[PDB]
Amino acid sequence: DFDAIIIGAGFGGLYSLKKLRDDFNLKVRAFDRATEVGGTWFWNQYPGALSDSETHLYCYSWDKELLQEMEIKRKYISQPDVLAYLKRVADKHDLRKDIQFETGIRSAYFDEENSFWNVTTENDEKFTARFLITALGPLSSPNWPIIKGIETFKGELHHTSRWPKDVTFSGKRVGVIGTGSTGVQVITAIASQVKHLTVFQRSAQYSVPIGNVVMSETDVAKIKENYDQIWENVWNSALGYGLNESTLPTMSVSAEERDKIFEKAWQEGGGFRFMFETFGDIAVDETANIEAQNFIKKKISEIVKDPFVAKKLTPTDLYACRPLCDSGYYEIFNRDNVSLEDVKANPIVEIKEDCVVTADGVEHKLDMLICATGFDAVDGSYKRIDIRGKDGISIKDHWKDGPNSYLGMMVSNFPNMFMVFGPNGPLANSPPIIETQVRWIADLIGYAEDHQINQIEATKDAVDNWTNTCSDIANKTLFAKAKTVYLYMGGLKEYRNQISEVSNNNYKGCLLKQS
Ligand SMILES: Cc1cc2nc3c(=O)[nH]c(=O)nc-3n(C[C@H](O)[C@H](O)[C@H](O)COP(=O)(O)OP(=O)(O)OC[C@H]3O[C@@H](n4cnc5c(N)ncnc54)[C@H](O)[C@@H]3O)c2cc1C
């Protein structure tokens, strides 16, 4: 028996464990398939892996001594350094003694008689707990491209999600399929290391410089001396990225003024900075969105000296989402050892023992093929567990059409289960989201223990209520004319207001059962 079982030992699961064990004195065990803490920062060790958030904000805020001890080496933080940070958190707070590593959870079945969860590992070990905390992260299974003959390739074949140690690039012909955030990071990191690089691009996206520079001891001292105000700014913001979130309409200033504002953000770096510190309506007004696109289009044409390559890199969609972030991506395509293939116009039709074949019949001979082709959607990690709630309803069937929840944390028919960084949550920097959710869930569990209530479940109506306010906010946005509602788009501050009103009003929308 435990009071709570936690699935996952990334950012989300580690603070869940700290909060429930040490602040609410509950008996807790966490599980992870990994051999070490860190979650996605343990699993994802591909070349160029880098935070989107600046280093001083991509971390916990709840341990003030840890903040003052923070290593802030560069403006953004690389994967080995995030992993080392989370390892330090687990060291300082004695967390691993209550984490069972190398242990996958195969099933969790709710026992309506006892009002607790029966949790079974992949090695048939059974544990019981009143509450189930699912901290599964935003990514499900690695998505491989479905291409005839991929199994015949005899060279090195790697998905970015399983990047092996000891990979060497010198002298090799390498291909990369995929040009999302991970593909851009990999391509930028390895182009100078390989004999030849072929990029297989299905859809060009916009990318802005990230501006990753070293941090002087003075830069760092200025942050740490003001850290309380910095976090207060996070909690009162929509995105939690430390931005000065603009209200200025894009088309309310002159062309010369507009160019200077975009250039300012371009030089300082960051994708959210470009989209939301410049002007206030780029995600809302079609004309504003096109102006932002055209700024980046002009940059691509200036950086990439061959205009035919520049055209291939230039996105074609009418409206644009938030741009990627890079450390020298477009410059890569000026190199003599880089070839860009548009596989919308010239699709991949076959992989053979030594090559990728495109529809023009060209054999692209490769020593190594890197699939930066992404992951299944967030609800996949839930459906990959055999989770059965009331009446034995499985989460696979409950979410057959997509995920739906209350506040991003509670699922109807699944009592005493609480999601951390689950579907239908806010779009903001993730550590502040996870801290917000862990603290709300722990307060709810604490109120349960005080009031002797043993079953907490959100109602069908509350879920539909949450789905509607997500739909209503999203429909003021361009993001239907671009690439169930997966995200609450009201921002971090309003999300915290939303869940504060629920807890202040006796957990409206939650069925509470007393024993
Ligand atoms: C390179 C990179 C940069 C990023 N930068 C940012 C950024 O700047 N800002 C931002 O907001 N987000 C960013 N993200 C995304 C987000 O911050 C991370 O996904 C975040 O660390 C998620 O933490 P988590 O604990 O919620 O999930 P994860 O770190 O994904 O941890 C989930 C864990 O659950 C375990 N698990 C799952 N199913 C089971 C099971 N059945 N049994 C046992 N264990 C299981 C997994 O093994 C995994 O270890 C970035 C992601 C990457 C890859």
Ligand SMILES: NC(=O)C1=CN([C@@H]2O[C@H](COP(=O)(O)OP(=O)(O)OC[C@H]3O[C@@H](n4cnc5c(N)ncnc54)[C@H](OP(=O)(O)O)[C@@H]3O)[C@@H](O)[C@H]2O)C=CC1
């Ligand atoms: N640094 C990071 O990696 C971070 C990632 N994230 C999130 O993590 C998730 C994963 O990012 P990423 O790993 O880049 O995965 P993405 O899904 O974002 O991009 C996948 C890439 O592979 C291409 N692709 C997929 N299938 C095929 C195919 N069959 N043939 C050819 N090309 C294909 C896609 O092209 P198309 O566009 O045509 O499908 C796209 O270019 C995203 O949701 C991202 O927002 C968030 C923060 C940081």
